[PDB]
Design a protein around this nucleic acid. Structure first.
Ligand code: MG
Ligand code: MG
Ligand code: MG
Ligand code: MG
Length: 127
RNA sequence: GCUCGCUGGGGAUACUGCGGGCCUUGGGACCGGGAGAGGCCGGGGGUACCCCCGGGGUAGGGGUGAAAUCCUAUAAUCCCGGG
C-alpha cells in the first residue's frame, strides 16, 4: 500500500530539529538537528542548516519505505516565543525536493489560556 | 467733630429670628420591565507549565553581540502511552 509517516519540526531562534516518526508517532524513523550538520553555534538556526538536516532525514526515511509525511511545525511556545525561527519553511521545502510526498501542514505551537510567568522580571531584558 | 460705645421712652414691619397654619418643586420611601468584570459562599472546567513511571531512538541539547558555566551514555534534547 502506502506507508505514511509524520514529520515533527521544532524551530526556534537558536536551533532546528527535524524528526520523522510513523503514522502513530510511537516509533522513531529518523532524527536530525542543526548541530549535527554544521560546526558553528551561530549557523545552527540558518535556513541552509535546516535544508541539510532535512535532506539527511528524508534520505534515511526513504531507505526504510516511507512514501509521504504529514507535517507538524512548532515554535517553542508555552511562556517562550510563539513565532517559529527562520528554518521551518526551508525544512518543509527540502523534504519535498528530496523525494517525499507531502500531506497536510499544520502548526501545533502550544498556546496557554493564561499560564505561567515568564523570565526577566517586570522590566524584561535590558540591552 | 472725637471717646462708634451705654442707657429711658415713642413709632414701622420689608428682610432675619421666634410661634401657629397650609404646600410639593429639593431630598427620602415604594411599585414595574430591564443593564452591569459590584461583593461573599459552594460546585464544575480550560489550555499551558514542572516532576515521576513505561515504550521508541542516539549524540548532542541549552544559551549569547560573541562565548562559557549548566544538562546529557545512571541515555539527554525530540516523539508516544499513563500518573
Ligand atoms: Mg549545538
Ligand atoms: Mg538570573
Ligand atoms: Mg551595553
Ligand atoms: Mg526511556
Amino acid at each position: 500500500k502506502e506507508k505514511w509517516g509524520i514529520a515533527h519540526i521544532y524551530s526556534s531562534y537558536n536551533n532546528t530539529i527535524i524528526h520523522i516518526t510513523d503514522i502513530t508517532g510511537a516509533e522513531t524513523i529518523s532524527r536530525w538537528s542543526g548541530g549535527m550538520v554544521v560546526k558553528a553555534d551561530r549557523d545552527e538556526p540558518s535556513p541552509y542548516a535546516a535544508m541539510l538536516a532535512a535532506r539527511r532525514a528524508a534520505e534515511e526515511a526513504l531507505e526504510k519505505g516511507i512514501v509521504g509525511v504529514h507535517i507538524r511545525v512548532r515554535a517553542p511556545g508555552g511562556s517562550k516565543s510563539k513565532t517559529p525561527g527562520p528554518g521551518a519553511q526551508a525544512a518543509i521545502r527540502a523534504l519535498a525536493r528530496a523525494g517525499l510526498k507531502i500531506g497536510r501542514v499544520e502548526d501545533v505551537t502550544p498556546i496557554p489560556h493564561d499560564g505561567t510567568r515568564p523570565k526577566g522580571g517586570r522590566r524584561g531584558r535590558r540591552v
